[PDB]
Amino acid sequence: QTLLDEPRPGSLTIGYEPSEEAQPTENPPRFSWLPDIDDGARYVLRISTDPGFTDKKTLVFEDLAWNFFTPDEALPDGHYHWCYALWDQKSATAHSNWSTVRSFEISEALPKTPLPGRSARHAAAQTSHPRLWLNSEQLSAFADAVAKDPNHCGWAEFYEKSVEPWLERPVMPEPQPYPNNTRVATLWRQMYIDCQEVIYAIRHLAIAGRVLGRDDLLDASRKWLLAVAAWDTKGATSRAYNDEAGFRVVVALAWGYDWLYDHLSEDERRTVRSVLLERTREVADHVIAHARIHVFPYDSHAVRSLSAVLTPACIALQGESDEAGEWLDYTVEFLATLYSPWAGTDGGWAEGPHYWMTGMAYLIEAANLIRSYIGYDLYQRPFFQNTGRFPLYTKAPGTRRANFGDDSTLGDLPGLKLGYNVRQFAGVTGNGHYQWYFDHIKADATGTEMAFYNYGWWDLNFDDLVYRHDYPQVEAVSPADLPALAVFDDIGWATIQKDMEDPDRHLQFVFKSSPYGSLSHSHGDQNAFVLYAHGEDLAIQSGYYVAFNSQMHLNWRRQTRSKNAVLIGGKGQYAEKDKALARRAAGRIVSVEEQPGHVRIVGDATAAYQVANPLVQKVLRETHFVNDSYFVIVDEVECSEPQELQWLCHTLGAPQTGRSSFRYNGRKAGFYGQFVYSSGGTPQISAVEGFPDIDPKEFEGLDIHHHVCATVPAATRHRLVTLLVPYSLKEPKRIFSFIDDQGFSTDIYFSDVDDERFKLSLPK
Ligand SMILES: [Cl-]
Numbered sequence: 001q002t003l004l005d006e007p008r009p010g011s012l013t014i015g016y017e018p019s020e021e022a023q024p025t026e027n028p029p030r031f032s033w034l035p036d037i038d039d040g041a042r043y044v045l046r047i048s049t050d051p052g053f054t055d056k057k058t059l060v061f062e063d064l065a066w067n068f069f070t071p072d073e074a075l076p077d078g079h080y081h082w083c084y085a086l087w088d089q090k091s092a093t094a095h096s097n098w099s100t101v102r103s104f105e106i107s108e109a110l111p112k113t114p115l116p117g118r119s120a121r122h123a124a125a126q127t128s129h130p131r132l133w134l135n136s137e138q139l140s141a142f143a144d145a146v147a148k149d150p151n152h153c154g155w156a157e158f159y160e161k162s163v164e165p166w167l168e169r170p171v172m173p174e175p176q177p178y179p180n181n182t183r184v185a186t187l188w189r190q191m192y193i194d195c196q197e198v199i200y201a202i203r204h205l206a207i208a209g210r211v212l213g214r215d216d217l218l219d220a221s222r223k224w225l226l227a228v229a230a231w232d233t234k235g236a237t238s239r240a241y242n243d244e245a246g247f248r249v250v251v252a253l254a255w256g257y258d259w260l261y262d263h264l265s266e267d268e269r270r271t272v273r274s275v276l277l278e279r280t281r282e283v284a285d286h287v288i289a290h291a292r293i294h295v296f297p298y299d300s301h302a303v304r305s306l307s308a309v310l311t312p313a314c315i316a317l318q319g320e321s322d323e324a325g326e327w328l329d330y331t332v333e334f335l336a337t338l339y340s341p342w343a344g345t346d347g348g349w350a351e352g353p354h355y356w357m358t359g360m361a362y363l364i365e366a367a368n369l370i371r372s373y374i375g376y377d378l379y380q381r382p383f384f385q386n387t388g389r390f391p392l393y394t395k396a397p398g399t400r401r402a403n404f405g406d407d408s409t410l411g412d413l414p415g416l417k418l419g420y421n422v423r424q425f426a427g428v429t430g431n432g433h434y435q436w437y438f439d440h441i442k443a444d445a446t447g448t449e450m451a452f453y454n455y456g457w458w459d460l461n462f463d464d465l466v467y468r469h470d471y472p473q474v475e476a477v478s479p480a481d482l483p484a485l486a487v488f489d490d491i492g493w494a495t496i497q498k499d500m501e502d503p504d505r506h507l508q509f510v511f512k513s514s515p516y517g518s519l520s521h522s523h524g525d526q527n528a529f530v531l532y533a534h535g536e537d538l539a540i541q542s543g544y545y546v547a548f549n550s551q552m553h554l555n556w557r558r559q560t561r562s563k564n565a566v567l568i569g570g571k572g573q574y575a576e577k578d579k580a581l582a583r584r585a586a587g588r589i590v591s592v593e594e595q596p597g598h599v600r601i602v603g604d605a606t607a608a609y610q611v612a613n614p615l616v617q618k619v620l621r622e623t624h625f626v627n628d629s630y631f632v633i634v635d636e637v638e639c640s641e642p643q644e645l646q647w648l649c650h651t652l653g654a655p656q657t658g659r660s661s662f663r664y665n666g667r668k669a670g671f672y673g674q675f676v677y678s679s680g681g682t683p684q685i686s687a688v689e690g691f692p693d694i695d696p697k698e699f700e701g702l703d704i705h706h707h708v709c710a711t712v713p714a715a716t717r718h719r720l721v722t723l724l725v726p727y728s729l730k731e732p733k734r735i736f737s738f739i740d741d742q743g744f745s746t747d748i749y750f751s752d753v754d755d756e757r758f759k760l761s762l763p764k
Contacts, residue, residue, distance in 0.1 A: 002086055002096040007034040011519075011583040012298050014068070014338065018082075018104040025345050025382060027110040028071040030337045033084055033099065035067040035295060044087040044094050045069055051081040051101060063087055066294055066330065070115035070337045075106045111382045115336040116374075118329055124374040129261035130210065131315050131373050132254065133466055142469065143211050153468040155211070162461040163208040166201040167220065171227045175245060177236045188242060193456045195237060195248035198228055200459055202252045206259035218263045225256035226268065229275045239282040247309045250279045254316040277321055280313040284327045294330075297338045298520065300351070300359060306331055307366035315373050332370060335378055339363070342516075344490030347386030350514065351521040352405020353394040353418070360387070360421045361458060368424075368466065379428045388425030388434045391418050392479075393486040393495035394510055397440040401540035401652075402508045402532040404493075406521040406557070408453070408545045416445045416454055420463055423474075427467060432477025439476050485594055491516060492526075492589045494601045496625055504668070504728065508532040509631075511623050513587030513603030517574075523558045524575030526587030526605035527621040528565040529633070533726035534669035539564050542650040542705045543691060544698075551695045562691075564650055566635055568619070569643035569714075574611035585611040590620070598758070599625040615639045626750065626758045630735055631724040634762065642714035645680060647722060649673060650707040657685045662708040671726040673708070676737045677748060680715035719762065721748060 009015045015022060018029040031045060043064040050057040061069060064087065081103050086096035116124070128136045145152040150159075175191045178184060202224045209217035228249060231237050239246035253276040257269070264272065283305055287293060291302030310331050317324035342350040342359070349356035367378040378384060394403040395414040409415050419441030426434035449460055479500040486495045492514035499505035511529045518524045531539035542562050546552040556562045560572025574585035590602040601623045609616040622634035637645055649655075655664040662685055663672040675683045690704040712718060727733040733752070740747040750758040 004086060004096040004099055005037045006099055009034060011580040013295055014297055014341075016100070016102060019102040020104070024104055024106065024110060026113045027074045027106055028114055029075075029104060029106075030068070030070050031082065032068040032338060036086055036096070038086075042087045042089055043067060043069075043084050045082065045084045046098075047071075047075070047080055047082045049078055049080055051103075053081070053083070062092070063089055065326075066333065068294055068333070068337045070333065072117040072120065073114050074112040077106055077108055080104050080106060111380070111385075113381050115333070116376055121329070121332065121374050121376065122325070124376075125315075125318055126373075127319055130259045131318070132258045132312055132369060133372055134469075135372070138469075139210055143213060146211055153465055155465070158204075158461050158465045159208060162200065162459055162465075163204045163217075166205055169201065171224050172198050172201070174227075174231045175236045175242075177241070183242075188244070189452065189456070191236065191242055192244035192248060193452060195245045195252070196456050198224065199248055199252040199255065202228065203255035203259070204459075204462070206256060209263070210259055215263075218260060221256060222260055222263060222268070225253070225260060225264075225272060228252055228256075229272045233275060233278050233282075239279070239286065243305075246279065246282065247305055250276070250283060250309050250313050253279065254312040258312075258316040273317070273320060276313060277317060277324070280310070280317065280327070281323065283309050283313070284323070288327075288330065293334065294338065297341050300342070300355070303339065304359070304362045306334060308362040311366040311369050315369060331366070332374075332376065335363070335366060335370075336376075336381075340383075343383045343387070344488050345382060345386070346486075346488045346490060347383060347388065347390045348488030348491035348493055349387070349390055350491045350516040350519075352407065353391045353403050354407035354409060354415075355405060355521050356387070356390055357415055357418050357421060360424075361417055364421060364424050368470065372470070379425075384425070385429060388422050388429065388431060389486060390488065391422055392433065392437050392482075393497055393508075394493070396497060396500055396506070396508050396532075397437070397444055398503065398506060398535060399508050399532045399537065401537045401542070402530045403510055403541060404512050404525055404528070404530070405523065406545070406548070406553070407541070410541065410543070410545050413444050414441055416442065416448060416460065417458065419445070420458075420460060423467065424471075426474040427471030430472075430474055432475055433479055433482055435474040436476040436479055485592070485599060487589065487592050489589060492587055492603070494589055494592055496599060498628065503535045506532070506535045507726075509623075509625065511601050511603060513589055513605055513621070515586050515588055517584060517586040517608060518558065518582040519579060520582075522582075523563070524560040524573030524585065524608065525563045525565060526573060526585075526608040527603040527619065528560075528563040529623060530564060531631075531671070531724070531726065533671065534728045536666045536669035537652065538664065538666065538669060538671050538726055539724075540650050540652060540705065542707070544702055546698050550698055551693075552691065552698045556691050556694050561648065562650065563648065565648060566619070566621075566637065567646035567648065568609055568616055568637055568639065569613055570646070571609070571613045573605065573608040581611055585609075597627045613643075615641050615643055624758075624760065627752070627756055629733070629752070630726065630750075632748075632750070632758075632760055633722040633724060634760075635718060635720040635722070637718040639716050642716055644714040645712040645718045645720060647675075647683065647710040647712075647720060648707055650705060652703070652705060654689065654706045655687050655708045657687050657708060660685070662687070662710075664708075665729060668729055669726065670729055670732070671724060673725075674723045674737070675710055675720065676723050677719065677721035677739055677741075677746065678712050679717065679719040679746075681713040683710040683712050683720070685710045719746070721760070721762075723750070 014032045018024040045061040048058040083098045085094035088095040150156045205221035237245045291299045314324045314328035419438040423438035494511045496509040498507040513526045558575040585608045587605040593600040603621045605619045618638040620636040624632040651664040655662045661674040686709045738749045746762045748760040
């Protein structure tokens with residue numbers, strides 16, 4: 001008997017799930033285990049209520065191709081055990097010892113989301129073409145419906161905006177290598193934009209041809225398709241040379257092959273298929289063998305190619321490639337089982353809302369294609385049921401700098417695709433708040449549709465056509481009744497929204513203390529907050545995108561010093577390049593409490609500071625949202641040796657400072673901050689301009705931002721209480737405070753101008 005190797009998990013691998021440390025969130029559970037030493041191993045999985053795994057009480061899933069699995073049926077409520085072994089295909093038996101036994105509970109509260117097995121999915125997949133978006137029955141019904149009314153699903157708008165332009169256009173010439181195979185940003189981008197247009201032309205002409213019964217459009221589509229099929233698979237548009245170009249060529253070939261299938265001669269089909277298979281194999285070998293996302297599921301670049309590239313290519317190829325059958329199974333099973341380690345059960349996305357936009361964009365495409373083709377609906381999984389609200393609470397219309405993480409749009413209004421993604425989730429859930437969000441994001445942002453960051457990535461007219469055909473339209477509902485508080489526990493984000501519909505009263509507050517640390521597109525921003533109030537960005541996410549790996553990115557935006565957060569002993573949270581340490585440099589939401597007039601959120605960022613400073617023993621931050629009007633921030637820090645405390649807050653313009661306060665006024669709103677209590681000593685307050693130690697060429701011609709720094713003398717214990725009062729410039733506000741520090745606790749009494757009161761009581 002072979003001895004099964006059961007490797008230790010790492011910071012960037014899958015874990016062994018389900019278990020008592022990781023109870024299932026769905027029924028049936030999503031199973032994963034680290035693979036044996038032999039990468040060409042097959043597995044057998046056993047599930048039983050009997051931890052002895054007696055034959056009659058046990059479910060057995062034999063001959064599994066991969067180290068992850070979702071069963072095709074929900075389990076009865078109860079207590080279960082599971083193990084796995086290596087499986088010998090020929091003799092039909094386990095050829096290794098059984099793994100560690102792990103346990104889990106199934107209750108009725110768990111959403112029931114089974115994955116139809118390989119046989120059922122293969123049987124559900126029709127043999128005819130087309131397959132992508134519409135089957136032949138649907139295509140027929142849609143053609144009849146467009147014959148009776150050219151405005152059916154907005155077809156007339158789609159034809160005009162997304163088909164018509166390609167009728168005049170000469171077939172895109174094959175992209176050329178760079179001067180001396182040395183990549184330049186302009187040429188790299190133009191190249192993948194060129195390949196994106198090849199998707200649009202081939203796909204939209206073919207669709208128009210089939211919908212309108214027009215052979216001439218089919219002929220025009222075919223012309224682009226054969227030209228692209230003739231491009232050098234080892235040339236400039238290969239995955240190896242420019243993967244962005246390579247990805248797009250595969251998608252173009254897939255839509256053309258699928259929708260022109262019957263229009264192409266058998267020989268033309270052979271030409272296209274051969275090149276489609278060859279290019280698809282390049283992508284599949286990268287996702288499966290190199291990126292190895294079934295072991296390393298955080299690789300979003302590889303997950304994107306699985307979703308956006310593999311899905312359409314493999315669907316187009318079904319029945320005419322055994323390889324493609326296997327790659328489609330992997331794709332479907334991966335999205336059903338392992339997608340995604342960035343996703344929280346409450347709908348949060350650990351990388352932040354900008355990366356939610358791009359990530360969801362390509363997940364949505366895969367899910368829509370798969371639902372149509374085999375009738376399996378990924379959106380039924382609870383993450384997708386919940387995730388529409390993440391951008392609703394972190395990227396509300398009008399907010400520019402009021403969230404966290406890498407954001408290529410930082411400083412601008414929320415991107416169009418955020419609304420479009422959320423509309424998809426409106427369709428799924430029937431939620432009218434999601435529709436409202438779509439309407440308002442679109443209104444604020446349209447006119448940027450043809451800009452390279454949208455046009456080079458998705459045709460929104462096609463998104464519309466597909467959405468209107470596939471989903472019932474949801475009526476927008478005012479966010480006036482939207483819950484003020486949304487907690488995303490798994491990722492450690494807490495958000496408050498007030499008066500979202502009102503441009504003069506709208507508040508967006510977000511607090512972050514994440515178990516994900518500074519990993520990947522997250523920063524050293526645990527126990528940090530951002531604040532948009534009275535319709536303006538006040539306490540901001542600072543700096544500019546510039547580029548990944550710029551000084552602005554690495555030395556400002558990743559670092560705690562750019563955040564509305566504390567520094568201890570002159571040091572921030574670990575935010576360098578070591579991925580394991582980045583993940584270790586973590587926070588967590590300790591508690592959230594809510595009653596009328598008082599929201600209390602507690603964050604613990606101890607590990608986050610400890611990684612870079614072993615002197616640190618405890619780092620807690622409380623944020624109080626008081627009487628729907630102002631904030632009280634409580635910073636509690638313990639160290640083994642005297643360390644000073646710095647309290648930072650960032651703004652678009654220069655703050656003015658005082659003896660125990662600072663103030664910033666923007667265009668229509670403003671806020672003041674006051675240090676009402678500091679056990680470690682009276683804070684010294686400074687206003688700082690710009691981005692220290694950052695190359696000014698990186699932000700040339702752009703306005704500098706500012707921050708206030710309040711420094712408390714070195715102490716082993718800090719308790720700092722900061723009152724933050726936002727206001728409309730039309731009605732500036734003042735909050736009064738009294739400290740009662742006698743007793744076993746420090747009591748702070750707050751009152752407004754109408755003697756409305758709040759009492760903070762902090763045990764000593
Ligand atoms: Cl979450």
